[PDB]
Write a protein that binds this ligand. Structure first.
Ligand code: HEC
Ligand code: HEC
Lengths: 126, 126
C-alpha cells in the first residue's frame, strides 16, 4: 500500500509510536502507582493487540530506511521469528488482561517489554 | 497518557497517519483498478474501525499544537459531533464490508471520505 519506501517507513514508525503509547501507558498500573480497573486494561490491551500486528507488513523488501538495520532483510527468517515471538507475548498479555489477573498482567508486561528490547538490540539503529 | 501536550500531538498525528493508510489503500479496490476480495477488505476495515476511534482522546484540553485549529477546543460540542459522525460513517463501511457488498462499499467509502474533508475544512490548519 506504499507508493515509495518512504511511505512504508512513515507507516511503521507511526504504528510503533502508537504501540509504544498503548504499552507504556500501563506502566503506572503494573507498578501500583495508578489503580487497576480490569475492564479499562482489557480494552486497552485489545487496542494493543490490533496495533502490534501492524508494523511488520511495512518492512517489505526494499523498504530500507529510518532506523531499521539492514539485517532485517538479510536475516528475514530471524526477523520473522522475533516479531512472531513478540506477538505471542502479546497473546499472553491479552490472556492476563481478559482474566483480570493483576499478577499475570505484571509478569506478561515484563515479558513483552523484554521482547521489545530484544528486537531493538538486533534490528534497530542506535 | 501524555507527559506533555507534544506527546498528544505526536500520538494523534500517528493515529491519523495510520487511518489514512488503511482508508486510502482501498481506493483502487473501490474503483475496480484492483480486485475485490471480500475477506481482505473485511479484515482491513476492522483495523480501520479500531484506528478510527483513537485520535479523539489525544485532543484533550490544553493539547493545542500541530495543525489543529483552536476551534477544536472553543467549539467542543461541534467537534465531538463531527468525530461521532465520522465514526458512524465508519460503522456503515464496516457493515458494507461485513456483508461483502461492493456497491454498498463504494457508497460508504465516499461518505467516509466526505466526513474526513468536512472535519478538515473546519478544524485543520492549511
Ligand atoms: C522487532 C521485531 C521489533 C519489536 C518486537 C519491537 N520493535 Fe520497536 N522498532 C523496531 C524497529 C526496526 C524500529 C525502527 C523502525 C524504523 O524504520 O525507523 C523500531 C522503532 C520503534 C520506535 C520509534 C518509532 C519512530 O517514531 O520512529 C518506538 C517508539 C518503538 N519501536 C517502540 C517499541 C515498543 C514499545 C515495543 C514493544 C511493545 C517495540 N517497539 C517492539 C523493531 C521492533
Ligand atoms: C475531525 C473530526 C477529523 C476527522 C473526521 C478526520 N480528521 Fe484528519 N485531521 C484532523 C485534524 C484536526 C488534524 C490535525 C492534527 C494535528 O494535531 O496536527 C488532522 C490531520 C490528518 C492527517 C495528518 C497527520 C500528520 O501526519 O500530521 C492525516 C493524514 C489525516 N488527518 C487524514 C484523515 C483521513 C484520511 C480521515 C478520514 C478517514 C480523517 N483524517 C478524518 C481532523 C480530522
Amino acid at each position: 500500500q506504499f507508493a515509495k519506501p518512504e511511505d512504508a517507513v512513515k507507516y511503521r514508525q507511526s504504528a510503533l509510536t502508537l504501540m509504544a503509547s498503548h504499552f507504556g501507558r500501563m506502566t503506572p498500573v503494573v507498578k501500583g502507582q495508578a489503580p487497576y480497573d480490569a475492564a479499562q486494561i482489557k480494552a486497552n490491551v485489545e487496542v494493543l493487540k490490533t496495533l502490534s500486528a501492524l508494523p511488520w507488513a511495512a518492512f517489505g523488501p526494499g523498504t530500507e530506511g529510518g532506523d531499521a538495520r539492514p539485517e532485517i532483510w538479510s536475516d528475514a527468517a530471524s526477523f520473522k521469528q522475533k516479531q512472531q515471538a513478540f506477538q505471542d507475548n502479546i497473546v499472553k498479555l491479552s490472556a492476563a488482561a481478559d482474566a483480570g489477573d493483576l499478577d499475570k498482567l505484571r509478569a506478561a508486561f515484563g515479558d513483552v517489554g523484554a521482547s521489545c528490547k530484544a528486537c531493538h538490540d538486533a534490528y534497530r539503529k542506535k
